[PDB]
Homo-oligomer: A and B are copies of this chain.
Amino acid sequence: GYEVHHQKLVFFAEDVGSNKGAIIGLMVGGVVIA
Please give me the residue from chain B that is nearest to A7 by CB atom.
Answer: B29
Residue contacts A-B, CB under 8 angstroms, 30 given = A1-B1, A2-B2, A2-B3, A2-B31, A3-B3, A3-B4, A4-B30, A5-B7, A7-B7, A7-B30, A9-B11, A9-B25, A10-B12, A10-B24, A11-B25, A12-B12, A12-B19, A13-B16, A14-B15, A14-B17, A17-B19, A18-B20, A19-B23, A21-B34, A22-B33, A24-B27, A25-B25, A25-B26, A28-B29, A30-B31
3 closest residue pairs by CB, A with B: A13-B17, A9-B25, A7-B29
A residues within 8 Å of B by Cβ?
A: 1-34
